[PDB]
């Protein structure tokens, strides 16, 4: 874990690990060597090495950083250059939404919803859409788009909508694409051992 | 000011009347050390407020000073006692209906995916989403304030708290909607026309 200036500005850098809690730690210990640099509401970037094998730590490290003060702009894919880790290769981005775990609007296409609780959206959720969540998420409207929830908290956490229209549905570490009947708030939910959709009025979990 | 007693109902915590909760909580934390090992990290006590009509809106902290603390709350005592209702001791989202006589007590947001029938309650820090039908009382917004708010998908609920707000009116039948403070009152719409 270390930050580099670039011309995508300020990046957090973390590097391929084994253990969250020490990059979190990392990332904390980073931080306070500053001294208080960073100013109430300064964003960066974040760039995370061989990142498809850390996708559902995402969450928690974009959570942290807020508990810090710092708002996650976007995230990189890409890497260092060899002796000017302060040049970066973007092979790909993404942008990232500042919002918390309350959300009371619409997630238009484009934009991407995270946060390692449950995530309650009072607007709907457009077809470009997406969220990371590492526990449950409920769209109190029309759910289209992706929404991945449980990357942290695991199998128990659930995926509800109004109008469960998602292209795709995740919770840990299972898929679905799978949809809710037209206008019936429904609940995505694992079940047996597959992500089953069923109504609120005749759910049954466990 | 604070004090634990064994009773018939089994341990209770007794919280006489305060004027500032931090104190309160002070206390609970000091008893707490005075009854030595007394207590066991798994221990359900009874808690039991004095004017508690005053305090309705410190149960969330309070519980959650004395679950950090070891102590898990199993039900709350009115009054020797007059009324009563079993704590649901639980997480963040509930997947069962909360029953009449029963109190669901976070600090956070609540969701419940079920129903919260008529002599039912939750007492949340933050908001409440329950996918059902709403019917016990809804008290939000008691840690964060003003921001919270409550929906449904049948919102008919005998009384709606939000932080220092509340309302008795209820949502149009089976249309999802949301109670937010608004103006300087709380406000019920449909979901489809929210406007905060």
Redesign the interface.
Known sequence: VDFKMTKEGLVLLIKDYQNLEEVLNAISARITQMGGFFAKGDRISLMIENHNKHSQDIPRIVSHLRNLGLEVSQILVGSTVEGKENDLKVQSRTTVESTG??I?RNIRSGQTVVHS??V?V??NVNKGAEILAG??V?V??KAQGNIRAGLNEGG???V?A?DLQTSLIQIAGFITHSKGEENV?S?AHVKGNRIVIEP??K?S??
Do not use: M, N, R
């Open positions: 775990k309350v009371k609780g449950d309650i009072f607007g526990g449950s409920v109190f409207g128990q956490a659930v509800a109004l708030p609940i609120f009025d759910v979990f466990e």
